[PDB]
Structure 1
Amino acid sequence: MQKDLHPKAVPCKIIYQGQVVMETMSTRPEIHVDVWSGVHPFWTGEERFLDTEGRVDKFNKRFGDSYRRGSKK
């Protein structure tokens, strides 16, 4: 576990898949894709209880970063 936020999780899942609409606005739709991928934020440098730096991403990051709910800066 080394790709999340610290101040909460947000990684994983992701069942994408494209098609060729054309519905309600007349006739019916169609299907295709069948893949799976990722989806997340980014991480910055901080620190806690003797150095540590942290990581976690935006959102959250905007938070605790501002504040700090287990270790500040």
Structure 2
Amino acid sequence: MKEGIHPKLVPARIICGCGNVIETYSTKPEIYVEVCSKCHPFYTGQQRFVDTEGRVERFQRRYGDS
């Protein structure tokens, strides 16, 4: 890497909906990540929260009782 012209890329800390990624090793140490998926909310480590498909599921249910 040519000497001049460069971000620092110095060891860091960092945060999320989870705890830390000690890994870091980036420019601009100590950053705040809004939420990740990995660390397993939101997709990975499937939460499947709020979950859909209820549209065929419902109309066949409220229907024949009424």
Q: Quickly name the TM-score band, shorter chain normalised.
A: under 0.3
TM-score under structure 1 length normalisation: 0.23
- Normalized per residue, which structure has more strand? 2
Q: Which has the higher contact order (CA 8 A, sep 6+)?
A: 1
* Max Rg structure: 2
